[PDB]
Design a protein around this ligand. Structure first.
Ligand SMILES: [Cl-]
Ligand SMILES: [Cl-]
Ligand SMILES: [Cl-]
Ligand SMILES: [Cl-]
Ligand SMILES: [Cs+]
Length: 124
């Protein structure tokens, strides 16, 4: 039901903050974005740039996706991101995440018309 583009936005965009606040940032965002609803999503990255800047990566450097697809694009500059990863002691429904703030290039897979990000492949 949710489109691939809308799901990308819900799971990865956080333009309201320039960077991960506290160490509690991942526990509040994984929950508020309904990512701990049926289970604990194990890993997830949030991008703290405007939607328009993330969408423009689809016109940047074309690289291979980890899965071998060729519709991946690496951003030219680094972006503010937050990595959210379940801790060894996380157990649904008590999901617990480690927040790691970093500044790096993002690699996204793009598709459709308009050609927008539909999958977060990795950061470098
Ligand atoms: Cl959409
Ligand atoms: Cl939702
Ligand atoms: Cl991710
Ligand atoms: Cl994804
Ligand atoms: Cs930037």
């Amino acid at each position: 039901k949710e489109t691939a583009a809308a799901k990308f936005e819900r799971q990865h965009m956080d333009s309201s903050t320039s960077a991960a606040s506290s160490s509690n940032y991942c526990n509040q965002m994984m929950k508020s974005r309904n990512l701990t609803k049926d289970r604990c999503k194990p890993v997830n990255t949030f991008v703290h740039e405007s939607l328009a800047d993330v969408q423009a990566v689809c016109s940047q450097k074309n690289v291979a996706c980890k899965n071998g697809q060729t519709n991946c694009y690496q951003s030219y500059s680094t972006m503010s991101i937050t990595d959210c990863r379940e801790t060894g002691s996380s157990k649904y429904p008590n999901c617990a995440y480690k927040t790691t703030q970093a500044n790096k290039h993002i690699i996204v897979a793009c598709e459709g018309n308009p050609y927008v990000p539909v999958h977060f492949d990795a950061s470098v």
